[PDB]
Design a protein around this nucleic acid. Structure first.
Ligand code: MG
Ligand code: MG
Ligand code: MG
Ligand code: MG
Ligand code: MG
Ligand code: MG
Ligand code: MG
Ligand code: MG
Ligand code: MG
Ligand code: MG
Ligand code: MG
Ligand code: MG
Ligand code: MG
Ligand code: MG
Ligand code: MG
Ligand code: MG
Ligand code: MG
Ligand code: ZN
Lengths: 69, 55
RNA sequence: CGGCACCUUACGAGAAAUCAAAGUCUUUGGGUUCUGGGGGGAGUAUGGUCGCAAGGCUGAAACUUAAAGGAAUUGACGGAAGGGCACCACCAGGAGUGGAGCCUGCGGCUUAAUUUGACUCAACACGGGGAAACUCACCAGGUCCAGACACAAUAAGGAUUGACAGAUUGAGAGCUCUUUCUUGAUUUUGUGGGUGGUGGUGCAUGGCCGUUCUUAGUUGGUGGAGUGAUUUGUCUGCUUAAUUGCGAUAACGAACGAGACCUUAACCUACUAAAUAGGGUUGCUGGCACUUGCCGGUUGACUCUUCUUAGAGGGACUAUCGGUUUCAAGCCGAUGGAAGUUUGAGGCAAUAACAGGUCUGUGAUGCCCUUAGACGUUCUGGGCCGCACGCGCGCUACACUGACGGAGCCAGCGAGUACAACCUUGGCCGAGAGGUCUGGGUAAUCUUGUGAAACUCCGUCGUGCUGGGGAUAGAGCAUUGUAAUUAUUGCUCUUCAACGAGGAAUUCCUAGUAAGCGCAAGUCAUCAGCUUGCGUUGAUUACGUCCCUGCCCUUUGUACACACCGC
């Protein structure tokens, strides 16, 4: 057979940078809750917006926002 | 009847031919096409007078 | 009585060829001389001796080696000899190929890569291999896990799954690095363990195929010949396509192979049958001559089975007659007969094999390799198609037995869609190609009488590289598909090249054949110069022989047996 080419640069699947008990949401009083950012208009509450410099999206609908918030 | 047989060393090819007897074949001919069996003839007595036998 | 000489059985012998001695030998002893003791080293070394010499007589060992020999048996083979057979041999002829251009295979070169298998017949239009991607194996590049299962590291303060936006990216590949949202224990990180591979090896195998060979060969049971391997049967002759038979015969009767068999191709006014096959009378109905008659068109009626199909049967058995041949097997000629070449054509097709091909048909597979940036997969763009040039199938032509126009106008094999997009008549548009509307057909019904060509008739050019010939070319019009440039193919105009029947060589062929001619399916989205079939037109010359070529036997010889590519 013919020899393999060998440029060098390999690309692996990203490990994702997992993070839980994320700093979204808050509570001040104790009794009631204070939501941070916002929930989805398309789907029901529980899902939360992605916040960037005048650009939003959500993951349950893979990524489908446009309007600011 | 052909049938391959897989073993540790490799394959063994088994083939089997069984020539059924013509008499027990039923479907198709009951005998080979070349064989010509002739029946045995039957004896008769010549002459014994002209004679008659009426009713 | 004497020396220079055959046949059978050997009971005498002998390993056997053979031997009337090579006999009277394990039932061992007539009388004597001489010679030999695995092969080589070696008739050498040395010494003697004999010689003019060359050489002779005489004559070692060291060391080496498992065979060296003999005889025959079967093979294989032989530039041994006889006898067969075959248009893959040749004659007598035809058609050719080889030349020309062009297609297409295969080399060689080229190229990132122009993937690979196979090279006398038995590689080279083969891989059903006419590659636009797919196919695909190759290259440049990217993607993906499709890493089964076992066992631990994270075990939700996330394992890992996803992810629009533009840069990113060939690129509306989240391929990612920009991102900060999702996803919930699938996974995933390891370690056992599989899995896939048009990766390798056909000289590790299966199956299938090809080839010895579709040639005529092959076998065993007794019985005989041999100690035996073996042999005879299985053969002098003549026949036959055939180890086909007749005969002759230590052979007799048998089996396989051939034949028989099967399928198809031919005959049936004899049967059974039909508005899905064809006719007859007659109705209505079109035109004619105009008497009653001629051609029609209509599934209107009635009836038929010749052609049709296709069921059941027969029919050819070399039949009758003549010669010819030990008056056998058969062969040769006339007669009849649809058929007298095994009636034609195939289908199958023995024993033993080949290191023939195929591990790129295969969830046929051994072992090796590989095995998560794969040699797995999958996308994207190419490539198999490149060109100083060799050969191999092929097509097109070198015209007047033609070309071109009109006109005449006749086949058979087939094939063909409902979950797809098949064949596609009929009507309109278009010089064409091709578009459109509509049908008919799941099919003796519709395409389709596939009114296919080559042919036949009347006219135009007349033997000039000409209107022969059509290549390369440029442009546009079409179609298939996602994609047509490295013209896919079709059509339209234009360009008009080589080639005046092809040297040495060599292929194919014996009758509905050869050759010509087209159709046909196969592959197929699209492409035929290919292929398996089909029919149409339809000859020339044998109807023999071993000259060549191959193959087969027989007898011969053999230091060969991995078998002449031998030793
Ligand atoms: Mg690579
Ligand atoms: Mg010796
Ligand atoms: Mg041959
Ligand atoms: Mg090709
Ligand atoms: Mg061919
Ligand atoms: Mg093509
Ligand atoms: Mg495979
Ligand atoms: Mg494999
Ligand atoms: Mg082999
Ligand atoms: Mg080989
Ligand atoms: Mg015997
Ligand atoms: Mg014999
Ligand atoms: Mg006679
Ligand atoms: Mg025949
Ligand atoms: Mg028809
Ligand atoms: Mg010209
Ligand atoms: Mg082809
Ligand atoms: Zn959403």
């Amino acid at each position: 057979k013919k020899v393999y080419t060998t440029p060098k640069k390999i690309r692996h699947k990203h490990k994702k940078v997992k993070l839980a008990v994320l700093n979204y949401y808050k509570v001040d009083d104790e009794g009631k809750v204070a939501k941070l950012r916002k929930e989805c208009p398309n789907c029901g509450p529980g899902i939360f917006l992605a916040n960037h410099g005048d650009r939003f999206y959500c993951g349950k609908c893979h990524s489908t926002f446009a309007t600011q918030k | 009847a052909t049938r391959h047989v897989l073993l540790r060393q490799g394959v063994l090819g088994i083939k089997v031919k069984i020539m059924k007897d013509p008499s027990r074949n039923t479907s198709g001919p009951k005998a080979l096409p070349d064989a010509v069996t002739i029946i045995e003839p039957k004896e008769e007595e010549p002459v014994l007078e002209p004679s008659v036998k009426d009713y």
